């Protein structure tokens, strides 16, 4: 049984992953069958191990979808809403760093000749 590692999953092709989900689900059901009688190990733990095994296999296949989507939407502007850095609502709309630093042509003249220079006072 030996509780599935994520590392063990990540080598496997997607076709093998989906295939292992079917096999674990049939096992989950066979263990639910045991659960009725108060199944062969007197109170039933093995049912928890396998339900969480199906969760972990689902996740590794989902993460492979997630990165597949990321690499396609990489180089491509306006990526799907869930790839967009869910930070906070305010922060997203709060003026990109380029568009805050923007200074009028005149302010560039003013600063260019006269930038505040590190001097000293006194005795």
């Amino acid at each position: 049984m030996v509780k599935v590692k994520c590392s063990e999953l990540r080598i496997k092709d997607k076709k093998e992953l989906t295939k292992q989900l079917d096999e674990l689900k049939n096992e989950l059901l066979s263990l639910r069958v045991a659960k009725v009688t108060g199944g062969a190990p007197s109170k039933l733990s093995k049912i928890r191990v396998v339900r969480k095994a199906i969760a972990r296999v689902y996740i590794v296949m989902h993460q492979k979808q997630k990165e597949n989507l990321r690499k396609v939407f990489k180089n491509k502007k306006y990526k799907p809403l869930d790839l967009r850095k869910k930070k906070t609502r305010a922060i997203r709309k709060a003026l990109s760093p380029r568009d805050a630093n923007r200074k009028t042509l005149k302010e560039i003249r003013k600063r260019s000749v006269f930038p505040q220079r590190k001097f000293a006072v006194k005795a």
């Binding site: 689900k25 989950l28 059901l29 066979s30 639910r32 069958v33 659960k35 009725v36 979808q65």
Partner: protein, 92 residues
């Protein structure tokens, strides 16, 4: 995404009821009685039973338990005898 189909044949059938009265209905009336998802529209139940256990389903009648769960009484085609199938699922 796209978001994977959240009612697989698995999820639809949670458990067989296995209660004392339910077992009688396997014997006599050739029905296999299942605890089902509250999302399972009867036609879900037929599909899932057919697919998981090879059985041709004649009709399905559905009750809600006062325990907030569904009972689905699945009538089997006369070609398939219940009691063999219940013990293929491993439960007496």
């Amino acid at each position: 995404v796209p978001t994977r189909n959240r009612m697989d044949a698995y999820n639809i059938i949670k458990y067989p009821l296995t209660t004392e009265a339910a077992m009688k209905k396997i014997e006599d009336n050739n029905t296999l009685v299942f605890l089902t998802h509250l999302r399972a529209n009867k036609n879900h139940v037929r599909a899932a039973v057919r697919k998981l256990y090879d059985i041709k389903v004649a009709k399905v009648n559905v009750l809600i338990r006062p325990d907030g769960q569904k009972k689905a009484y699945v009538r089997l085609a006369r070609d398939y005898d219940a009691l063999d199938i219940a013990n293929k699922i491993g439960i007496i």
